[PDB]
CSV table of C-alpha atoms and ligand atoms in Angstrom, one decimal:
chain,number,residue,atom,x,y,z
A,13,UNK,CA,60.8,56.8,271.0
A,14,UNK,CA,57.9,55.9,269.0
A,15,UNK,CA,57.5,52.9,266.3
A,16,UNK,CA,57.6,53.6,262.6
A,17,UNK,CA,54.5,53.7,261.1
A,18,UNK,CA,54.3,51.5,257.8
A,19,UNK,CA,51.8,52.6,254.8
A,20,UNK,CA,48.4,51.3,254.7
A,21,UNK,CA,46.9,50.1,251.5
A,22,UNK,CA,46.9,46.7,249.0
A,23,UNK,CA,49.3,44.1,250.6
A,24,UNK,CA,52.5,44.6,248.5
A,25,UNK,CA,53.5,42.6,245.5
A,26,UNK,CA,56.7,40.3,243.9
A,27,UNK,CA,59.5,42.3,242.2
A,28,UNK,CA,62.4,40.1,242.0
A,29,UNK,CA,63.7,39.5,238.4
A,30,UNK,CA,63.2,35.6,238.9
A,31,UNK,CA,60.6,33.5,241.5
A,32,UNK,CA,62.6,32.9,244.9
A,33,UNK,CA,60.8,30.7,247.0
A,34,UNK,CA,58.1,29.6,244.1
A,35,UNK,CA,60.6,28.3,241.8
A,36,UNK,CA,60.7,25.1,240.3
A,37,UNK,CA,63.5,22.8,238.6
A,38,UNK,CA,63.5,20.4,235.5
A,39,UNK,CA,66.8,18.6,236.5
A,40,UNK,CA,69.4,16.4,235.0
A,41,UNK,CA,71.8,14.5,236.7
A,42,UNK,CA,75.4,14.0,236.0
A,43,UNK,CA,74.8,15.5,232.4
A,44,UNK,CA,77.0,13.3,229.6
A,45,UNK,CA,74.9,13.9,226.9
A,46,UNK,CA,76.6,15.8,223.2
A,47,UNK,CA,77.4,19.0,224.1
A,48,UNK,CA,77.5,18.9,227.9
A,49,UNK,CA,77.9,22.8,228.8
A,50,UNK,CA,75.9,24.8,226.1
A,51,UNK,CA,73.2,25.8,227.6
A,52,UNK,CA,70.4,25.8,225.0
A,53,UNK,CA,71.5,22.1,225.2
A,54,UNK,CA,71.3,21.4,228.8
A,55,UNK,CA,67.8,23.0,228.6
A,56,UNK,CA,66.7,20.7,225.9
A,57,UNK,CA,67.5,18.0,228.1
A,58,UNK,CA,65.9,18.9,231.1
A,59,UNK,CA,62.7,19.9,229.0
A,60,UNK,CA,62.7,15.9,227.8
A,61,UNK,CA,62.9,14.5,231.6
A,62,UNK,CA,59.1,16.0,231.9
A,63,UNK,CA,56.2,14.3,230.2
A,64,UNK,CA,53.8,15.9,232.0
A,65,UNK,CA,53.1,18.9,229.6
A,66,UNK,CA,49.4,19.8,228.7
A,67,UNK,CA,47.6,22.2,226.9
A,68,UNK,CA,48.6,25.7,228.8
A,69,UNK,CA,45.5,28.3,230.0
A,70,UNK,CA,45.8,31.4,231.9
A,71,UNK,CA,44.8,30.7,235.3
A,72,UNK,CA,45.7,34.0,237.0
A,73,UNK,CA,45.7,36.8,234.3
A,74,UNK,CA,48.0,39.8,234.7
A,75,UNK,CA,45.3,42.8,235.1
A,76,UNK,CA,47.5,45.4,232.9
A,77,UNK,CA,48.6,42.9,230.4
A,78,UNK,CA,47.6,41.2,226.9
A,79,UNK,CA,46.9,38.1,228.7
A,80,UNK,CA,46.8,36.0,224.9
A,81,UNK,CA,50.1,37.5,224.1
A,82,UNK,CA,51.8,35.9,227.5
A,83,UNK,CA,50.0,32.5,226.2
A,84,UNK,CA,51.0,32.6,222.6
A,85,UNK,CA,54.5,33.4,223.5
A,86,UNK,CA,54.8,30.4,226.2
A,87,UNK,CA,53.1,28.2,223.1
A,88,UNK,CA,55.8,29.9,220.4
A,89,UNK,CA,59.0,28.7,223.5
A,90,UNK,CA,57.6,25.1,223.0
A,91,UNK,CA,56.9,25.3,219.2
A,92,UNK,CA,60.7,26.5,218.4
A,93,UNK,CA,62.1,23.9,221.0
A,94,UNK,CA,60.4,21.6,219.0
A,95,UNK,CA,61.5,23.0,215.9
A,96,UNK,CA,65.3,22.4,217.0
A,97,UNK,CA,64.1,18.9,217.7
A,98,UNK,CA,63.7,18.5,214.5
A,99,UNK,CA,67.0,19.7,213.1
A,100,UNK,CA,70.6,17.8,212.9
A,101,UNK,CA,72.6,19.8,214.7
A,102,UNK,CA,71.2,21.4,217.8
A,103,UNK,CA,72.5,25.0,217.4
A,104,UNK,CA,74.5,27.0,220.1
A,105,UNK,CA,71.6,29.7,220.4
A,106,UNK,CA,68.4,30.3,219.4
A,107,UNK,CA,66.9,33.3,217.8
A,108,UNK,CA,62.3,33.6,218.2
A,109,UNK,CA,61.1,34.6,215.5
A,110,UNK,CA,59.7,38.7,216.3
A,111,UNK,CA,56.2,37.6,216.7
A,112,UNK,CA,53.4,39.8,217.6
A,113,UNK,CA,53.0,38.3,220.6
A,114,UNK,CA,56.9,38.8,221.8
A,115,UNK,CA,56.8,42.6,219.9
A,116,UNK,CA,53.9,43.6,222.2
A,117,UNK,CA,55.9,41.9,225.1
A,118,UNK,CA,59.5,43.3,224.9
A,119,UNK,CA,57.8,47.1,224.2
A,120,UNK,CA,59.1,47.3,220.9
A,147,UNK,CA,51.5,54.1,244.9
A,148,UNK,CA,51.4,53.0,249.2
A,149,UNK,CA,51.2,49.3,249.7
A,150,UNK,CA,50.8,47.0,252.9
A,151,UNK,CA,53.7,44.6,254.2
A,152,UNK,CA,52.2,41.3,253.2
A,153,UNK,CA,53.0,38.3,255.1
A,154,UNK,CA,55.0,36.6,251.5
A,155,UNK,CA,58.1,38.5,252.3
A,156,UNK,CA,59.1,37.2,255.4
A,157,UNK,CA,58.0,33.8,254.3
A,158,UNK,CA,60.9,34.3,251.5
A,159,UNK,CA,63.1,35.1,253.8
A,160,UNK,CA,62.6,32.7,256.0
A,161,UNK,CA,63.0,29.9,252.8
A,162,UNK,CA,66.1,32.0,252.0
A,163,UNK,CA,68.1,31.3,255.1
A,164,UNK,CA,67.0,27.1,255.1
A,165,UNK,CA,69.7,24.3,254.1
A,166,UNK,CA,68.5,22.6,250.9
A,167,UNK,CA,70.4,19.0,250.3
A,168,UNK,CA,72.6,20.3,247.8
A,169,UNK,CA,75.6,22.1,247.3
A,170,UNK,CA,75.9,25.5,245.2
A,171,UNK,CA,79.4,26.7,245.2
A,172,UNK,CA,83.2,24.5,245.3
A,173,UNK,CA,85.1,24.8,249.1
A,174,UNK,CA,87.0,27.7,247.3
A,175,UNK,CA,84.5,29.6,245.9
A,176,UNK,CA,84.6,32.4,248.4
A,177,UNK,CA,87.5,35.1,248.3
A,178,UNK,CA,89.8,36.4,245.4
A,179,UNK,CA,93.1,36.5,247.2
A,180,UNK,CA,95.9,37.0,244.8
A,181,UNK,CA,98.2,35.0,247.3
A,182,UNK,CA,97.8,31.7,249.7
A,183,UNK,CA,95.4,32.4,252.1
A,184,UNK,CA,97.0,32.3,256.1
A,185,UNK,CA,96.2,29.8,258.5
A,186,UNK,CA,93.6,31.6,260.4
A,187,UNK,CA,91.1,33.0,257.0
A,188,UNK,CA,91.1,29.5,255.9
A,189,UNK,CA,89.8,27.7,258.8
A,190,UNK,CA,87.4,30.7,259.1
A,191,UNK,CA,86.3,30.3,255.4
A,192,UNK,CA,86.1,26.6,255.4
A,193,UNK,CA,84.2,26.6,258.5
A,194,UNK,CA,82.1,29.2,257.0
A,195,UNK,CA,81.7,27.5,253.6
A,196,UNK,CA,80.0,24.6,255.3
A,197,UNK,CA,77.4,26.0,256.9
A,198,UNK,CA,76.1,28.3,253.8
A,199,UNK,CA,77.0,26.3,250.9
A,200,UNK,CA,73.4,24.4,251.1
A,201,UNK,CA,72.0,27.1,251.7
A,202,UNK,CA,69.0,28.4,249.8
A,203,UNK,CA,70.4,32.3,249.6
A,204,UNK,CA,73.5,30.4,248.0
A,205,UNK,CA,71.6,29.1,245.5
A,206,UNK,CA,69.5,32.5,244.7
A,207,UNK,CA,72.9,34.0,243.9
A,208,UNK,CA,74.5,31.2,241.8
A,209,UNK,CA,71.0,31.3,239.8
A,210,UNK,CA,71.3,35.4,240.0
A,211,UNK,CA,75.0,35.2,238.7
A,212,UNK,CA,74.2,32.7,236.1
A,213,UNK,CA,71.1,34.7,234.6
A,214,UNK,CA,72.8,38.4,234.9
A,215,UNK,CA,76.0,36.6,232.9
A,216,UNK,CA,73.8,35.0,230.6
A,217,UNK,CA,71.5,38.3,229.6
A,218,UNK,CA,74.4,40.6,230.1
A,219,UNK,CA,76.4,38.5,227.6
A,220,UNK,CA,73.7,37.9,224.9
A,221,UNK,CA,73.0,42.0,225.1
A,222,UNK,CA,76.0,42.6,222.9
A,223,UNK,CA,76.6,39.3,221.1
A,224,UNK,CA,72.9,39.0,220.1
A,225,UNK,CA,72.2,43.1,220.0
A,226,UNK,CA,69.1,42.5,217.6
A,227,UNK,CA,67.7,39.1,218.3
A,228,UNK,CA,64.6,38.3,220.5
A,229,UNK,CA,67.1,35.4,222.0
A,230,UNK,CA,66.1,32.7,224.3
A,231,UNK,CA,68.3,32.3,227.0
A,232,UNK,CA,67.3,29.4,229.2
A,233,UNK,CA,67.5,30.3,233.3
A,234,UNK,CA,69.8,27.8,235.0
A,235,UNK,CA,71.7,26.6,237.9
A,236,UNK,CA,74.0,23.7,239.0
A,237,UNK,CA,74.3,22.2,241.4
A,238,UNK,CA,75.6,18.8,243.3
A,239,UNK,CA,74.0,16.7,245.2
A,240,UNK,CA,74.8,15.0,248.9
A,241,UNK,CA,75.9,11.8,247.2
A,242,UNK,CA,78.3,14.5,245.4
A,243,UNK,CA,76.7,14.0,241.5
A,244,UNK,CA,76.8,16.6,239.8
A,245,UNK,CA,73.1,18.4,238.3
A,246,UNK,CA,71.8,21.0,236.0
A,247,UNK,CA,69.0,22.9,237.1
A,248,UNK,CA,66.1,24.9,234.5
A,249,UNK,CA,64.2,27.2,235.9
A,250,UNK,CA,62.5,28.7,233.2
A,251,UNK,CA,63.6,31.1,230.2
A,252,UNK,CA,64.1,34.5,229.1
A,253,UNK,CA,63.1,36.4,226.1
A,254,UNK,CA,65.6,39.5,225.7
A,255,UNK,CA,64.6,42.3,223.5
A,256,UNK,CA,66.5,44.4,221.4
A,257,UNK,CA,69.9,45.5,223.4
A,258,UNK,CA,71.9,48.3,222.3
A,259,UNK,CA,73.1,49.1,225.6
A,260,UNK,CA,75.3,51.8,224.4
A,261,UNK,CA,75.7,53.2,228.1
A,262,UNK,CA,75.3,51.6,231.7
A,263,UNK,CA,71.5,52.4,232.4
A,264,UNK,CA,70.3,51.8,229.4
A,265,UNK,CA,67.5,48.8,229.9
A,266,UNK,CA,66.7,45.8,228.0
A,267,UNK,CA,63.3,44.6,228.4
A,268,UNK,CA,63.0,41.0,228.7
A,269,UNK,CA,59.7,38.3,229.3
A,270,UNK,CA,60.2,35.6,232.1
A,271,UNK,CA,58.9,32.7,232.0
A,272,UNK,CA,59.3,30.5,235.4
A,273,UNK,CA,58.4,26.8,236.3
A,274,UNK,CA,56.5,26.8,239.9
A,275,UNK,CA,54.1,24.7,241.9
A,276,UNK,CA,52.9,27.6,243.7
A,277,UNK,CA,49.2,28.0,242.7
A,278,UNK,CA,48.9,31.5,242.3
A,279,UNK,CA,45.2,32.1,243.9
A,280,UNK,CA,46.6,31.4,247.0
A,281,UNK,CA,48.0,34.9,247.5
A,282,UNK,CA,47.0,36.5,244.3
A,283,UNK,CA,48.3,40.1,245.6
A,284,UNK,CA,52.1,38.5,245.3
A,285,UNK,CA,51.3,38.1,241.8
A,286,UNK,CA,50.4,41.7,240.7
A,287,UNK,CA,52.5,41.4,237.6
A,288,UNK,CA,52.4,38.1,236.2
A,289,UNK,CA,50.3,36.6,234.1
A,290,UNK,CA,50.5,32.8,235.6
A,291,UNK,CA,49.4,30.0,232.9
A,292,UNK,CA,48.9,26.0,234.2
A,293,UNK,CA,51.3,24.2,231.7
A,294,UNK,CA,51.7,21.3,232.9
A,295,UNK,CA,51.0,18.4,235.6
A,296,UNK,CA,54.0,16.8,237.7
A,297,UNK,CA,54.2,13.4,239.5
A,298,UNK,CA,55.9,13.9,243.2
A,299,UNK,CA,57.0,11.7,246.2
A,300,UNK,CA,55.2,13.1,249.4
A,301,UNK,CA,54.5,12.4,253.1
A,302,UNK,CA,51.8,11.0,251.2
A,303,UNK,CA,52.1,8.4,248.1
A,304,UNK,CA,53.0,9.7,244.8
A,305,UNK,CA,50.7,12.9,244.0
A,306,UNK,CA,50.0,14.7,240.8
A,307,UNK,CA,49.9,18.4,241.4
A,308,UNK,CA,49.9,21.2,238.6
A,309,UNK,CA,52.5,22.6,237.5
A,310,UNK,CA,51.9,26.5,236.6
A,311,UNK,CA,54.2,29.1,234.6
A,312,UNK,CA,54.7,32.4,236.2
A,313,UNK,CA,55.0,34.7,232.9
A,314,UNK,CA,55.9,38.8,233.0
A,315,UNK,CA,57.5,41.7,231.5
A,316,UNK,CA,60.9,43.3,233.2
A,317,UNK,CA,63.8,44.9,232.3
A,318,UNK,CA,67.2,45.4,233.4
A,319,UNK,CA,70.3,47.3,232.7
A,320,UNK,CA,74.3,46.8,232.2
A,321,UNK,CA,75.3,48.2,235.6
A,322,UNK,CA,72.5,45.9,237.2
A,323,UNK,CA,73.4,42.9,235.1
A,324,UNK,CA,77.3,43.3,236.6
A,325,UNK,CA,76.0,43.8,240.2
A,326,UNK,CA,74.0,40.3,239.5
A,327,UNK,CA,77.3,39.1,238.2
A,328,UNK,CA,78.6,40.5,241.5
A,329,UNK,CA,76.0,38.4,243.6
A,330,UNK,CA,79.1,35.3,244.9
A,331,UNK,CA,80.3,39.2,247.2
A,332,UNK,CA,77.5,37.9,249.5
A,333,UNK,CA,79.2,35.2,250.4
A,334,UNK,CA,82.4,37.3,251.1
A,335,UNK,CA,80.6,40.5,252.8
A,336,UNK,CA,78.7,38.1,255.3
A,337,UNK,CA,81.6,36.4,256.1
A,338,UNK,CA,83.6,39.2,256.7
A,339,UNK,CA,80.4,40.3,259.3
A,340,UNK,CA,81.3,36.9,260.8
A,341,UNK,CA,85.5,37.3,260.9
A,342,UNK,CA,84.4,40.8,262.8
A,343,UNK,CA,82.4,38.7,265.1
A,344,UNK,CA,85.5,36.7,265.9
A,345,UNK,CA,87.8,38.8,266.0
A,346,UNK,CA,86.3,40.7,268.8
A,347,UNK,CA,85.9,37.7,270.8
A,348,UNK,CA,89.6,37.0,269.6
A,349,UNK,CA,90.4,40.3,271.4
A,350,UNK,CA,88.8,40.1,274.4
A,351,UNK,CA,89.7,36.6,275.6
A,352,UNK,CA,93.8,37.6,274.0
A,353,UNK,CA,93.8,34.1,271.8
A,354,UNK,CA,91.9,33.2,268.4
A,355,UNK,CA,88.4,32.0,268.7
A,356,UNK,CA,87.5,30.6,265.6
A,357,UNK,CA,87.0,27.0,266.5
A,358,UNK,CA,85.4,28.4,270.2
A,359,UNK,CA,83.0,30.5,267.8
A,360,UNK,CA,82.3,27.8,264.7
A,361,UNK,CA,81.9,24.8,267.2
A,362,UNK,CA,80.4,27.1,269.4
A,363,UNK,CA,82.4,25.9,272.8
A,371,UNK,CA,81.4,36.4,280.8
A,372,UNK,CA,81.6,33.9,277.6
A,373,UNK,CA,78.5,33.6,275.7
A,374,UNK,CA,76.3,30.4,276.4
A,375,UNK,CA,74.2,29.7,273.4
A,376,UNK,CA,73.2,31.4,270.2
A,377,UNK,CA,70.3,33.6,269.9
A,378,UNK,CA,69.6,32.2,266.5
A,379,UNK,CA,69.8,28.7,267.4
A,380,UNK,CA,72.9,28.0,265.9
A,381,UNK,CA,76.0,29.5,264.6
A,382,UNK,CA,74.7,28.1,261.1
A,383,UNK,CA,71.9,29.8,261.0
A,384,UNK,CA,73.2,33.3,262.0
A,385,UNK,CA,76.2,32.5,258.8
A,386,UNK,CA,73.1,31.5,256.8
A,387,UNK,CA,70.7,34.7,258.3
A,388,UNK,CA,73.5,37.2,257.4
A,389,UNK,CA,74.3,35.9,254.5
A,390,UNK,CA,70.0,35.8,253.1
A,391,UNK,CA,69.9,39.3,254.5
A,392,UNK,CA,72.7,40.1,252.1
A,393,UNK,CA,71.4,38.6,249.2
A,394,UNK,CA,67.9,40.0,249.6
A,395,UNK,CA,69.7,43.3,249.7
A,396,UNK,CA,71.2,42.1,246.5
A,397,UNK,CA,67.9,40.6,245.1
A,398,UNK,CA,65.6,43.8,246.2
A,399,UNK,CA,68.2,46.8,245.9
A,400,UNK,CA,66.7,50.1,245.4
A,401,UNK,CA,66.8,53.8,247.1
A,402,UNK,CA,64.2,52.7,249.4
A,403,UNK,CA,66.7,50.3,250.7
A,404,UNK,CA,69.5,52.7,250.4
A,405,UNK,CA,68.0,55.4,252.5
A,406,UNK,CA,65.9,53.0,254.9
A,407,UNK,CA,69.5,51.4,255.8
A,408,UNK,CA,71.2,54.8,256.1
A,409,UNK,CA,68.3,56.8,258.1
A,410,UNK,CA,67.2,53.9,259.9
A,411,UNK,CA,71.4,53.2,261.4
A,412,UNK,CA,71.5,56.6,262.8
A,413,UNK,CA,68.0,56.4,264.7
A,414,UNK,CA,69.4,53.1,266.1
A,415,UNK,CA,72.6,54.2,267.3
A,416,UNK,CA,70.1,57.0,269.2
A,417,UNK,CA,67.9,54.8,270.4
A,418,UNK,CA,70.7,52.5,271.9
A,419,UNK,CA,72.1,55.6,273.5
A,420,UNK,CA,68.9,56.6,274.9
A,421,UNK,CA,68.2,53.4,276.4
A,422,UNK,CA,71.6,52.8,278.3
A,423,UNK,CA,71.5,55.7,279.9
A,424,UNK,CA,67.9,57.1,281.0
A,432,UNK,CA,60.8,64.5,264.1
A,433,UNK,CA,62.7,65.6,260.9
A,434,UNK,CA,65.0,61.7,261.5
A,435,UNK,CA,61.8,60.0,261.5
A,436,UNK,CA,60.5,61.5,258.6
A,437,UNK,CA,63.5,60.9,256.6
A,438,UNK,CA,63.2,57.3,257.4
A,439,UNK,CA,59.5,57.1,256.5
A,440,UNK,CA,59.7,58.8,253.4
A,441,UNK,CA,61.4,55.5,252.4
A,442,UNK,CA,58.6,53.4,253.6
A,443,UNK,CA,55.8,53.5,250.2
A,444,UNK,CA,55.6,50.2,248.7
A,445,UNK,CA,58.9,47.4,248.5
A,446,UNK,CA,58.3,44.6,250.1
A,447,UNK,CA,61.9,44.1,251.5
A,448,UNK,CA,61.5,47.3,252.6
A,449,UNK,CA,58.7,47.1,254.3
A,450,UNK,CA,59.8,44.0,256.2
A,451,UNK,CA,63.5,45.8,257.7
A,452,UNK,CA,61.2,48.4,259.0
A,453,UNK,CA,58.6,45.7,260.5
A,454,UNK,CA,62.3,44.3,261.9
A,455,UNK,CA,63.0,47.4,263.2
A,456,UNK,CA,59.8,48.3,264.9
A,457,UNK,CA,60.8,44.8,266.8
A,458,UNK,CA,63.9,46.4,268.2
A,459,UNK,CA,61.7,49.2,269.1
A,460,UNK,CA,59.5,47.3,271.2
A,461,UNK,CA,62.5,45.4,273.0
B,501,6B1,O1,54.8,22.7,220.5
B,501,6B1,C1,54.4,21.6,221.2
B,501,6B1,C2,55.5,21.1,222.1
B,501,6B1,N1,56.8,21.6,222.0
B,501,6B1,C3,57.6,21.0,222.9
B,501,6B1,C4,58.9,21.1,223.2
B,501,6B1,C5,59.5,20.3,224.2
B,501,6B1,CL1,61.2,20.4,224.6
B,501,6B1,C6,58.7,19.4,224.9
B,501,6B1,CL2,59.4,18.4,226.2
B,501,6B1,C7,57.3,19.3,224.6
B,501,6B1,C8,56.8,20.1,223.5
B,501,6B1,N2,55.5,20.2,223.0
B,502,CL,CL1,84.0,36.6,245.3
């Protein structure tokens, strides 16, 4: 009967493995060059498209860290690039040397709902103007596909495949496989393992996308929650005074500065590098490899959405739902593009920002609703079960700030 009440304190902070809506791309179009597919070589490439490189500074230091160590280890990434420059044969991998700097790195509380998280979200469910996944990507039937499911998934495909969420999870699937693999083929080697995507664009060339890179620690991952520590290092042209709070755990150097078509002329903006320690785990690098399900679960949410309809009116309603024709007259969302594109960022933020918090916000919260609804048609220890959940994640914090909407109407 009464709205949640969300913790007071510092607004909360950024606790994805990689920048979301702060990321930035050195790109490559339809790559040709020697060894087209290796990644350590498709990150070379992008590194040579920028020229724009400068002397890197801490601009926003991470409070807990060893702010010089962050620094010296972005400087040793460019140094050993450079080094492989330098050689015949640019290798399949690369190995840092176990530096200070990267020893110290890889190891070897109520907050606020901040106003970022929705922003993310918000960026999550827009169309960019390229395309992440192939017009079969979603499903793993065994068989041919009926009639019906394909017209579904091929409507379905076209309204998410620009999507932002749709790239988060190509970029999450690549980086899990990427880590996950290098934890047992590299077990003792600080490798570098370049964070990348690809992508194509409207004109249909193909791209390769850098983010950034890892640093991986040692990696005997002899069972599934064992961790890895790792160091991120992520391109951005998000200043990070802006909204320092989001930045809580980085240490954020300016690296660079980049030349960029506008609603303006060409501008020349800075280009930063968002830099922290984190660490992951086998079972959590196979869920990221799991990431393309979020394309499959919120579709599914949509074929349950048809299929009622389908029911109701005794014929199938996919093209009356997709083309979007008492029968409903509009869509709450807008469109039915952006409620594919809203369930399916709502998935991958559940993906992105999993924890127990989210596990028993989602559970407690289901069963409060259902007695709510029941309440409202027809005239204590739940609550606190639900607010026990509510200390200091972000995505959290926002589904509760959702649900205290639903409250109100
Ligand atoms: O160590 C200095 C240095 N290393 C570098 C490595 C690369 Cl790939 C580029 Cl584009 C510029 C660099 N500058
Ligand atoms: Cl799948």
């Amino acid at each position: 009967p009464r709205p949640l009440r969300l913790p007071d304190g510092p607004p909360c902070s950024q606790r994805s493995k990689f920048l979301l809506m702060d990321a930035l791309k050195l790109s490559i179009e339809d790559p040709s060059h020697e060894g087209e597919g290796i990644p350590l070589y498709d990150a070379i490439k992008c590194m040579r498209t920028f020229f724009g490189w400068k002397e890197p500074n801490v601009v926003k230091p991470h409070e807990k860290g060893i702010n010089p160590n962050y620094l010296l280890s972005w400087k040793q990434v460019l140094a050993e690039l450079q080094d492989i420059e330098n050689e015949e044969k640019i290798p399949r991998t690369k190995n840092m040397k176990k530096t200070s700097q990267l020893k110290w790195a890889l190891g070897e509380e109520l907050r606020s709902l901040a106003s970022w998280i929705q922003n993310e979200f918000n960026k999550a469910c827009e169309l960019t103007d390229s395309s992440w996944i192939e017009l079969d990507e979603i499903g793993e039937d065994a068989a041919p596909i009926e009639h019906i499911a394909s017209m579904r998934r091929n409507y379905f495909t076209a309204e998410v495949s620009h999507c932002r969420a749709t790239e988060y999870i190509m970029k999450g699937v690549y980086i899990n496989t990427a880590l996950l693999n290098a934890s047992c083929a590299a077990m003792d080697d600080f490798q570098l393992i370049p964070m990348i995507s690809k992508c194509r664009t409207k004109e249909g060339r193909r791209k390769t996308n850098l983010y950034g890179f890892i640093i991986k620690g040692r990696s005997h991952l002899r069972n599934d929650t064992d961790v890895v520590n790792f160091v991120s290092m992520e391109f951005s042209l998000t200043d990070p005074r802006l909204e320092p709070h989001k930045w809580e755990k980085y240490c954020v150097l300016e690296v660079g500065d980049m030349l960029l078509r506008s609603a303006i002329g060409h501008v020349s903006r800075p280009m930063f590098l968002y830099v922290r320690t984190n660490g992951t785990s086998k079972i959590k690098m196979k869920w990221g490899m799991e990431m393309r399900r979020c394309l499959l679960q919120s579709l599914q949410q949509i074929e349950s959405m048809i299929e009622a309809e389908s029911s109701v009116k005794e014929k199938d309603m996919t093209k009356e739902f997709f083309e979007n024709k008492e029968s409903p007259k509009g869509v709450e969302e807008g469109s039915i593009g952006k409620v594919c594109r809203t369930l399916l960022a709502k998935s991958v933020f559940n993906s992105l920002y999993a924890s127990p918090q989210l596990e028993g916000f989602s559970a407690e919260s289901r069963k409060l609703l259902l007695i709510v609804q029941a309440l409202r048609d027809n005239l204590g220890g739940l609550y606190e079960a639900i607010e026990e959940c509510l200390i200091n994640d972000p995505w959290v914090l926002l589904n509760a700030s959702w649900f205290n909407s639903f409250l109100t109407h």
